[PDB]
Amino acid sequence: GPIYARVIQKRVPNAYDKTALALEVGELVKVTKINVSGQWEGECNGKRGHFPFTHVRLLDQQN
After folding, report:
1. How many Å is the Cα radius of gyration of the chain?
2. Which residues bear the site annotation Proline switch?
3. Residue 14 belongs to what domain range?
4. 28 near 42, Cβ under 8 Å?
5. Contact between residue 58 and residue 6 where contact means Cβ atoms under 8 Å apart
6. HSE-up of 50 (CA within 13 Å, CB side)?
7. CA separation for the pair 63, 10 (Å, rounded)
8. Using an 8 Å Cβ cutoff, are 48 and 54 in contact?
9. Which contacts qualify for 37-40: CB closer than 8 Å, 24 or more apart?
10. 15 DSSP assignment
11. Domains held by the chain: number
């Protein structure tokens, strides 16, 4: 299940940033690779990469 994570604090890192999500405060990253800790791999409508739970507020993965 991919969650929708309302990212409340992110930078603009391309897939060249060891493949990171280029997204921003207030945006939405749909994590297609989930975990328990919050260090998952995210996909934001065309951006693929990985980031932590530290600065995201996410809706569920069953939705």
Report:
1. 10
2. 2
3. 1-63
4. no
5. yes
6. 10
7. 23
8. no
9. none
10. T
11. 1
Instruction: Confirm if 12 and 44 have CB atoms less than 8 A apart.
Output: no
Give the position of tokens 């980031």.
Answer: 51
Q: Cα 6 vs. chain centroid, distance in angstroms?
A: 8
Q: Which of 3, 46, 53, 38 is nearest to 21 (CA)?
A: 46
- The coordinates were experimentally obtained by NMR
Residue 41 structure tokens: 């791999």
Look at the block and give the residue holding tokens 């409508």.
45
Largest CA distance in the chain: 30
The answer to whether 5 and 23 have CB atoms below 8 angstroms apart is no
Residue 39 and residue 52 in contact, taking contact as beta carbons nearer than 8 Å: yes
